[model samples]
Target: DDNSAITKANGENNAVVKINKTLNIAEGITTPTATFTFKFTEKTGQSSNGAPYQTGVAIPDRNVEYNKNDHPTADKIQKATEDIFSGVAYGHAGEYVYDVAEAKTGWQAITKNGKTIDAMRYDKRTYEMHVIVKNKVNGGVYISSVYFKENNKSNAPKVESSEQGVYNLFDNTYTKDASKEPNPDDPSQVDPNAKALTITKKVDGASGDKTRDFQFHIKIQLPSTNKTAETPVTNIIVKHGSKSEVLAVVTPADTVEYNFTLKDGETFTVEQLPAGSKYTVTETGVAGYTDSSIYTTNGAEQTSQGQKNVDFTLTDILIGEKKNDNKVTNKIDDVTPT
Candidate 1:
């Protein structure tokens, strides 16, 4: 006698159960690709008298995949549906009930290059669904109402709201545990082929000194998850035309800094930067130079003017065979006082 039930069915014998699959990920973390499954189990003694409900009614499982093309962004939801009594023949007209829940094996481990990188926590909410059926004018039976209750509680109080009969089924969380080593076999437990970042220097304008070395202070911040007490050393290669030098960065801070010197057309590259790291480069402004700007080319080109520092984050999209480039340009005005 709950008035919150969905009274109108879609068709003569079809009743649809809408389900939502929501995924929540940490900030700045990318969404993992995997498949999640949901199932329905009939509550044997919860049905009305003579409802023609059997033990092994065979309800199909709903599989939702979050792949590259069909995935919700970080902290988003995707909706799906499960049709009940779509084509099944009902011998009598009465109430039938079932329990809807996410399958236990829904949480799939995410792997990259055969190494387990992340894990997901599955939702544990279970819902009780009620389907009221009545005999049609013809020989078939039709569903009269459908509703859902929390935790299979038939006596749960009804609340007057828009989402009375609907249910938001599952909410899963994606976690990247940096404390746990992804691969136990490897002592370092770090990916051998990490992402690379390039910083280039360019000079322009009539008063610009092409041969003058510009001092740059660079800071590379490790991902929030990768911050630890131990000091990690990263090698940076500074290149000037045909000559290159290796600079060892040894620091205990999460954000490490290095002093670099680069002239016109010189570039420095950090070949083994960890994934999800963010970096910023600031150039010391020369007195004669009027403008200092930076341009970055990762997946897309971006420019920042009137600023000495430019920041960029290493994302999954930029972690391939390609290298992310940050070009810093200094311009000098040739105007003379009259």
Candidate 2:
């Protein structure tokens, strides 16, 4: 009788090939509802022992979507993985080689009002896959090993030990150039050269202190596209009427704070902030004020009897639209004698 050891391992010898898709985009930007495609094609003249490639073997195209809801965080690189070939069987014991790459037909440039605002950068990496198969003792075939090589390298590594660490990965980056797109609030207006955010303070009621300075604590956190923990600095222009100051913000840090004092009907703006930056403002409580409210032109409003903190995310800033503005109001009412 033939060897029984090889026959016992027949069912568990199939190969599982997996690939990954990574998306890098700015913060505050919405994830595109697009699907990317990948394909595997058999390499010519690479069959073992100079034999013709196996017939009736066809690999299907694989797809991955840019949906951020599947991931835990939206501000970081979104990654997805799928097993393209699971439990793939071979007809005979031989070596099979294939070329794996991303198809160039799945992505399109983002357009708004007849102008393109975002462009995509596709990964141009070409990977080579190898599958080794051996004849079983009794019948059929069994896969012995499977690996991948990058750019035709001499040292091919297994799927777990590949360059991307877990799976064969392809990275894509979507870049937004707001200078080429018009204002979202008004299509007829020209594009704003820089993104800006305005914070206004208002005091109401008969006993409200209009002349008194109100203390405010502001914090801005820039996006970390590279997913690094290193602290980097970026300059932003802060303006209050004719007065302007350049402030340096430590990117990806949550502890940096900016303090300001504003009277009634006064405002301060932060300009040239990159898209995907997150900011929050906290107004100190006043002795006479009983109620505080926060309003934004984007149609968001919140009112509280004691709380006056507001959070915002900076997207494509359209000048003069007030879409990204925060209006904070504090009120005090005097009861009349009845």
Candidate 3:
């Protein structure tokens, strides 16, 4: 049986443990076009009946195991595992081991890949464990070594006893089934943390015209009540519609309004934003028209919630009375003959 290959060789059997480790990559850690590799150095001796010592095993996707016996091609497996760790571009996660045993365990939670367990449970000596990948990296994530601990109890001496016997070192913690659906409790499934707000930087002066024409910054901070909670934003969108609106549907926001009537060259400012929101608007200096203005239709801080629709109007007048030929004619002060 394929399972026996890791444990038995040359028609002989010796008490030995297996080690399996699995790593789930963070979202887009490696580019979809880029492949990540790993190297696992299980104890070596290089032969059956020889005490295991130190040796090399290379595997991709950061998933690996400790294999000392000659189940598959020995030199090939050892070298491939080594090359994965040393090389940078030729590894793939899809090359993982699956169904190493003739019969399979009925685990149905995660994808049924031999990456975890493909053989029967070791009643007396076999053991498994798992570790999660919670990290950020550009230098490539690495696990230098794994530590194995053993425990024995005299009271429990049954077939499942953790007493005197060989123990399997395979990491079965995240078995083949658990990763399938990825529990809804996981953040990837359902994020209960802060919501994202995508402010569509737009100029409301012209209907159906939504775009940003200036350079500004945006900063996102975790929600807080401390005095420093109101921090300046810095994550900027240089041009219009360049920022990602990923959380548009899930993000929360409120719309405020501003209404005003002004003559040429007049300017105004509106303040006193609601507790949970911020206010933003812009004015484009037009050559032949007065600068535009934005405000709530009702002309005050809105007490309602949801998208605030502030209104703005721009009237383009003549420059230097050029439209009506009203350019400052020599003002001949015709006295009223008084």
Indicate which candidate wins on TM-score. Answer: 2
| Model 3 ranges off by over 4 Å | 1-24, 28-200, 205-306, 309-338
Clashes of each: 0, 1, 27
How accurate locally, in lDDT, is each candidate?
Answer: 0.57, 0.57, 0.21
Query: Candidates 1 and 3: which is better by lDDT?
Result: 1
210 in model 2: Cα distance from truth in Å? 3.5
lDDT of 2: 0.57
Displacement of the residue 23 alpha carbon in candidate 3, Å: 3.9
Write down the TM-score for model 2.
0.60
TM-score ranking from best candidate downward: 2, 1, 3
Candidate 1 positional error at 8, Å = 3.1
Q: What tens digits encode model 3's per-residue C-alpha lDDT throughout 1-338?
A: 31222221122111222323222211101101111122232322222334333223232333233232312231111112122223422121111111111112322321123232111121122211111111123332232211222224344221221222222222221111111121323312421111112122222232222222322222222111111222212222212223222211112322223322222222222111111123233332322222222222111212121112222222221111000100000011222555
Off by over 4 Å in 1: 1-7, 10-12, 24-33, 45-56, 71-77, 82-84, 104-114, 137-140, 152-167, 175-298, 307-338
List TM-score per model, in order: 0.52, 0.60, 0.19
